[PDB]
């Protein structure tokens, strides 16, 4: 059992499942979301435990275990 299932609460509030590994980076997680939702990884922001997850870090670095819910959000840019 090298992998575990996490959840992503998407833009409409619909929850999707993701099959991941502790060694998966946030970019890998965004690539898996892109496979289900079509959103490019560069537009995606993931919030977990009150923190926006950083590209280059892994699920183990953030201690994202099975049944974790990541919150997916995009951006409204303004000046």
């Amino acid at each position: 059992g090298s992998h575990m299932q996490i959840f992503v609460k998407t833009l409409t509030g619909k929850t999707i499942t993701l099959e991941v590994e502790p060694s998966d980076t946030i970019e890998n997680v965004k690539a898996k979301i892109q496979d289900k939702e079509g959103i490019p990884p560069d537009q995606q922001r993931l919030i977990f435990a009150g923190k926006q997850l950083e590209d280059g870090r892994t699920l183990s670095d953030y201690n994202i275990q099975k049944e974790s819910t990541l919150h997916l959000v995009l951006r409204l840019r303004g000046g």
Binding site: T15, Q43, G50, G79
Partner: protein, 308 residues
């Protein structure tokens, strides 16, 4: 008092959030208490404390303050904001709070920081396998809740919807450890610990798979002046709206941020260097568009609710 902030190159995303936070009374007080400790080393928190102290101690009641050192520091320590491009207010909000919390944690190290005492809440996620009826509970902290929206609704609907039971079925089946296989399940996220200040982020965006782009949702989403929220046991907490960060623009790639704040019973609108008193009825403009929802909207994006 009531001072606008200078825009230093598409920095309204930062100004609007700084104004909302200035009018979050426990946050302002803890920042001012941090300034009072008179720290010698410079970081994002000391800059924020210097800025809040300049706002608090200005000789007049109305004017303009430049957040020059704060913006300079923000650009230096974060590659993400190290540019002159337009940015998202919620991304800035979450970054600022976590950066402050890390500075405070590193100072305790040299437990919960006062940033967590103010904004942190806890959810309990419960997943019930519909095949074996096993329930798995998982607690997860938050500094804000990102809620999905719908046309002609209230933040009360969005908040209750966030905590509604969802059935996981077909492609989203849950891997149950009792069943050792994917099963239909009911997932529900309930608030276990309500925060002192509840920050609500409206997911005003929709991705169009067929068009390879996303749009801004300028939906009518009413925000009430008061909100009562419940804990899964203090059984509940009454909140009052204190600030709203508003995104102005027809789309998600460009725009302008402003903030409305409640101060001594009246509403103020802060738009970078300009401050104006606004009537309570004028805040309704920020619920979002009724008709022609593709046009330029001024819509509520981050709401700040203060517990009574």
């Amino acid at each position: 008092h009531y001072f606008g902030l200078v825009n230093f190159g598409n920095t309204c995303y930062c100004n609007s959030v700084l104004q909302a936070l200035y009018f979050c009374r426990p946050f302002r007080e803890n920042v001012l208490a941090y300034k009072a400790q008179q720290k010698k080393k410079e970081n994002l928190l000391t800059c924020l404390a210097d800025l809040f102290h300049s706002i608090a101690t200005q000789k007049k009641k109305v004017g303009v303050i430049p957040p020059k050192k704060f913006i300079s520091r923000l650009r230096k320590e974060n590659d993400l904001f190290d540019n002159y491009m337009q940015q998202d207010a919620h991304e800035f909000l979450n970054y600022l709070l976590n950066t402050i919390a890390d500075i405070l944690q590193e100072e305790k190290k040299q437990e919960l920081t006062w940033v967590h005492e103010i904004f942190q809440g806890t959810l309990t996620n419960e997943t019930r396998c519909l095949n074996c009826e096993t329930v798995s509970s998982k607690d997860e902290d938050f500094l804000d809740l990102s809620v999905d929206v719908e046309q002609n609704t209230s933040i009360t609907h969005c908040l209750r919807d966030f905590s509604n039971t969802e059935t996981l079925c077909s492609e989203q089946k849950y891997y149950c450890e009792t069943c050792c296989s994917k099963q239909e399940a009911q997932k529900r996220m309930r608030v276990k610990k309500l925060p002192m200040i509840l920050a609500l982020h409206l997911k005003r965006f929709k991705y169009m798979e067929q068009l390879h782009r996303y749009t801004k949702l300028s939906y009518r989403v009413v925000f009430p002046l008061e909100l009562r929220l419940f804990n899964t046991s203090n059984l509940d907490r009454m909140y009052d709206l204190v600030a709203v960060v508003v995104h102005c623009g027809s789309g998600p790639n460009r725009g302008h941020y402003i903030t409305i704040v409640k101060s001594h019973g009246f509403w103020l609108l802060f738009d970078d260097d300009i401050v104006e008193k606004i009537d309570a009825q004028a805040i309704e403009e920020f619920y979002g568009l009724t008709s022609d929802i593709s046009k330029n909207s001024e819509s509520g994006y981050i709401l700040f609710y203060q517990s009574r």
